[PDB]
Each structure stands twice: as structure tokens, then as C-alpha cells.
Amino acid sequence: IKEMPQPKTFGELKNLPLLNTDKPVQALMKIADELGEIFKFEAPGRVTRYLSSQRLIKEACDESRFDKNLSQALKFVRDFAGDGLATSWTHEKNWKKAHNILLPSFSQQAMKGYHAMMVDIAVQLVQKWERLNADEHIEVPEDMTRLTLDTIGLCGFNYRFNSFYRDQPHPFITSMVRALDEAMNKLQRANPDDPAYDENKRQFQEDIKVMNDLVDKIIADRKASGEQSDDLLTHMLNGKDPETGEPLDDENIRYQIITFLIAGHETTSGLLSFALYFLVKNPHVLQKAAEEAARVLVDPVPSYKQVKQLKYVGMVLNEALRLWPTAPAFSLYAKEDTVLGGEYPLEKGDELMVLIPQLHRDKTIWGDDVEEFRPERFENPSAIPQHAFKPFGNGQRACIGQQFALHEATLVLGMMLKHFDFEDHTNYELDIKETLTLKPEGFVVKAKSKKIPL
Ligand code: HEM
Ligand SMILES: CCCCCCCN1CCC[C@H]1C(=O)N[C@@H](Cc1ccccc1)C(=O)O
Ligand SMILES: C=Cc1ccccc1
Ligand SMILES: [Cl-]
């Protein structure tokens, strides 16, 4: 039995002030570099343990011993995502019911049905960049967020946010972004009942109303028309859980759409932004990926089967997820008393945080070149030990969107590499903004068209 390390304390505030920063996940990564594979973190009225090693995370991923916990972050998001899949407890009826109904709509086979709608938004991105004037630049995370939000809107509930027609986002997106900001800001808000925050609370309730009104109206419109589309909303309206025999109620369908819209906006855009960042910083890797894109994408419009053929592009995306997993942590609780790693006794209910960027820097797994961007380290994935690579979470509570995110990102990155050469014209210094997720901030490039028609 070992006593685990703990970072510096602030008297009665314990460790809490360490997270009073715009970059708290990056702060925790530096603490993990100093303290190692596990450290205790205390705040008034709570304790958790941050895990960074594959040795310990492999055990945390044992669903017989640990289940998904709602982090305080997810509990605050639950005020607008409700009992949607990501903010529900495993033991809530609506978790397994929505899981059973939606799993077949998110399978690799299901991606064939979304492919045409994904191509529609991907072509809008390519056309935007084709239409820039000489020496104009691209705002990378901005355009990747326009694309990923519009893709899940069109695939989620056949709704066009038309983000490529705008400087200022659709009002729904303004409200969702401000609600996500309020949720994450509340993690570091001392005295949340101070009248100073009456405006924040009023604004939060207004933003919840904007999101619910749009989504509830589209659900009501669809039910009335009886229209059948190639979309998640159609699948959720037609679906019955084989176990309970029940469909989802309209309120839960709304929470699933809001959940999907948060994911589209926050996750996939970050992955594409980090992937392009790593490609422009590693020109030999960019060349190899561009050669594959040219070899495989032989038609004006990529096909579903061509996207599956972009093997090296898939490896580039996995290597971007390794270094900067855009959903950077998940939380677990001990189902029963148990000993972690032969060393750390835990009581039933004790919480763990998995610090995914640190797991992905475990030199015992990846070797001494762990900070290098080397997609080829994914060439022989059977050689990777269990639970070493966790950008999509764990077990039955893993990302339902994984096939959707990777299909969209592979299609889009493949088209970007087919159609343009890229220049890091500012020699951009990586600056990672933290919202629900991690994204480059201020990342800009210049594209030079290869003048290949669509
Ligand atoms: C349109 C894209 C996406 C959608 C619709 C989506 C949707 C979801 C949903 C519904 C869940 C909850 C699953 C459940 O517990 O039953 C989830 C979990 C998760 N997703 Fe995704 N996701 C997407 C993209 C991504 C991407 C690109 C990443 C990472 C780069 C990501 C990382 C995760 C992680 C880490 C979890 C587990 C969270 C936890 O354990 O607390 N997601 N996603
Ligand atoms: C998709 C990613 C969602 C979760 C990412 C977590 C993102 N947090 C943002 C701050 C650090 C990180 C985290 O470790 N927070 C924990 C612990 C915690 C609870 C209360 C206040 C501060 C921290 C939590 O939210 O419970
Ligand atoms: C709605 C919140 C959420 C959280 C983690 C992954 C995907 C969605
Ligand atoms: Cl102290």
C-alpha cells in the first residue's frame, strides 16, 4: 500500500485554486509530469484521483470494478443536455434505452447512409477555400467548427445551420456556446449565489430556452409532416428499445439532438484542427498523406468505400488524437472497495479522472519519441497493449459517435489534402483553448489550390 502524491495546497481551498486558469487540463498535465501516474486532488467537500499511466488506466477501464461518473463538468452540462447519452448515469433507464435504440444508427454500416450529407458540407468547405483571393488565409478551427456543426445538424435532424453563409453563428449555436462557457466557468466560480451572477443565471436560462425551442419545434414539425429522412431524428422517431419495447419520448429525443450538436461543435472540429496543425509542422507526413489522397480520391466526389481506403489519413487522425485528444478526460467511480495497481486502496464510490493526454504520453507504451508526430506508430495496432489509447472513452460508455467522427474527419482531411497545398505562413505557435474540449486557438494557414475540379 502506497500514499499517493498531491500537488500544492491553498489552506482551506486545498488544491482548488490550481484550476483557476483558462487552461486547467494543461495545468493538470504539468502536475502529472511532476507527480507521476497518480495524484490526489482535494477541494472543499470533494476528492478525486488523476490517473496518467496505462498500468493504472487499464484497471480503471475494468467495468466490473468501475463505472462512468458524471464529472462536475458533465453535471453542469446536464442542465441543458439532460439525460441524453453523454450526461446520463449507466443505471438510468434512459441510458440503456437510448443506447439500444441509437447504436445501430452509429455503426460503420450506418455511415453509408450519412456519407452523401457529409460530402455536401465537405464540398461547401472546399468551395469556400477555392474562392479565397491570393494571400487571404484560413481560420482553421473556425472553418472546421462551421463544417462539423453543419454536418451533425444535417445528419442529426436534417437542419442547415448554413455556417458557411455567416460570420456570426446561428442563434442556436450562440446560445449553446454561451451555455457550455457558463457550465465550464462554474467549475471555478467561488460564491455562485453572489448577486454578481444573477445576469449569468438569467442568460443561462435564456440560452436553454433558445436550444429547447428550436429542437422541440423541429421534433414537432417532423412528427406532424410524417416525413422519413436519412437522419438520426427519423431513426429515433421509428425506434423501439428491444429490451423495454419502449420508444424514446420527445423530451429525450431533444436531449439526444442537443447532445449530438454539442459533440459535433466541440470534438471533431478540434481533431481536424490538430491534424492540420501536425501536418503543416511535419511536411514529410503531409506529403505522404497528400500522396494517398491523390492515389485514392480519383473521382470528383469521394465515395464511402474510397474514404475507407484512406488508411494513412486514418493513422494521421489517430496520431492527432494521441497527442491532443480533444475530449481530454473522463470520470469513473469504484463500484465496490478495490485496490488499484496493488498499491492504492479505494472505497466504494471513490472517484477517478483519466487524464487522456497524459495516458497517451506513457513512454512504457509509445517509446522515447512520444512527443513526435509519427502516424506510422499506428501501423501494427495489435501490438498496442490494452487501454493504452482512449480518445473515445471506455467500454459501454465509450463514444457512440466514434465511427461518425472518424468517417467525417477522414473524408474532409482527404479532400483538403487532394485539393490544396498548405503553408504555415505565420509559423504558428500552438495555443490550446479549453472549452468542453481542446482546440487550437488562432491557428491560420494559407491554401494554394491544386485546381482539381469538384
Ligand atoms: C459528431 C461527433 C460525435 C458525436 C455525435 C458523439 C456523441 C457522443 C455520445 C452520445 C457519447 C456518450 C455515449 C454513451 O455514454 O452512451 C459520447 C461519449 C464520448 N465521446 Fe463522443 N461524439 C462525437 C465525437 C467525438 C470525438 C471526435 C471524440 C474525441 C476526439 C469524442 C470523445 C468522446 C468521449 C471521450 C466520450 C466519453 C465521455 C465520458 O466517459 O464521460 N467524441 N460521444
Ligand atoms: C468532454 C470533457 C468533459 C470533462 C472534462 C473535465 C474538464 N475539467 C475542467 C477542469 C479540470 C477538468 C476536471 O478534471 N474536472 C473534474 C474535477 C473538478 C470538479 C469541480 C471543479 C473543478 C474540477 C470535474 O469536472 O469533475
Ligand atoms: C453533451 C456532452 C458530451 C460530452 C462528451 C462527449 C460528447 C458529448
Ligand atoms: Cl496549505
The residue ranges of DSSP E strands in 237-357, in sequence order, are 329-334, 338-340, 344-346, 351-355
Phi and psi at residue 423, to the nearest 5°: -125, 130
Catalytic residue among 80, 373, 392, 422: 392
**Residue 61 annotated in active site:** no
Match 422517431 to its residue by C-alpha cell: 237
User: What single letter denotes the amino acid at residue 274?
Assistant: F
Element (H, E) at 308: helix 304-308
Task: Measure the CA–CA gap between 42 and 384, rounded to whole angstroms.
Answer: 33
Task: Measure the CA–CA gap between 15 and 347, rounded to whole angstroms.
Answer: 21
User: What single letter denotes the amino acid at residue 48?
Assistant: T
318's grid cell: 489517430
Pocket lining: 358 vs ligand 1, CB cutoff 6 Å:
no
For residue 358, the CA-to-ligand 3 centroid distance in Å is 20
249's grid cell: 419520448
Length of the chain: 454
For residue 353, the CA-to-ligand 2 centroid distance in Å is 8
Task: Measure the CA–CA gap between 183 and 22, rounded to whole angstroms.
Answer: 14
Cβ within 8 Å of residue 412, ≥6 positions away: 118, 122, 125, 144, 147, 272
For residue 21, the CA-to-ligand 4 centroid distance in Å is 19
Task: Measure the CA–CA gap between 431 and 388, rounded to whole angstroms.
Answer: 26
- CA-nearest of 118, 115, 123, 70 to 303 is 115
Phi and psi at residue 324, to the nearest 5°: -135, 75
* Secondary structure string (H, E, C) spanning 425-438: CCCCCCCEEECCCE
Ligand 3 pocket test target in 74, 148, 271 with most atoms within 8 Å of CB = 74
183's grid cell: 457550465
Burial 334-351 (b: 16+ CB within 10 A, else e): beeebebbeebebeeebb
**Residue 392 annotated in active site:** yes
Cβ atoms of residues 293 and 276 within 8 Å: no
Match 499517493 to its residue by C-alpha cell: 4
3-state secondary structure of 227: coil
Task: Measure the CA–CA gap between 14 and 244, rounded to whole angstroms.
Answer: 46
Burial of 125 (0-12, 13-18, 19+ CB in 10 A): buried
Cβ within 8 Å of residue 21, ≥6 positions away: 27, 188
Query: First CA to last CA across the chain, in angstroms?
Result: 63
For residue 398, the CA-to-ligand 1 centroid distance in Å is 7
Cβ atoms of residues 159 and 150 within 8 Å: no
Per DSSP bridges, beta strands 138-139 and 338-340 are: unpaired
Neighbours of 271 (CB within 10 A): 29
Per DSSP bridges, beta strands 351-355 and 138-139 are: unpaired
Cβ atoms of residues 33 and 19 within 8 Å: no
Ligand 2 pocket test target in 72, 262, 400, 434 with most atoms within 8 Å of CB = 72
Instruction: Give the atom of ligand 3 at the shortest distance from the alpha carbon of 81.
Output: 1
Half-sphere exposure of 430 (CA within 13 A, CB side): 16
Ligand nearest to the CA of 17: 2
* Interrupted backbone of the chain, residues before each interruption (C–N > 2.5 Å): none
Cβ atoms of residues 187 and 71 within 8 Å: no
CA 263 to chain CA centroid, Å, is: 6
Element (H, E) at 423: strand 420-423
Cβ atoms of residues 50 and 28 within 8 Å: yes
Task: Measure the CA–CA gap between 349 and 352, rounded to whole angstroms.
Answer: 10
Instruction: Give the atom of ligand 1 at the shortest distance from the alpha carbon of 356.
Output: 35
Task: Measure the CA–CA gap between 291 and 285, rounded to whole angstroms.
Answer: 10
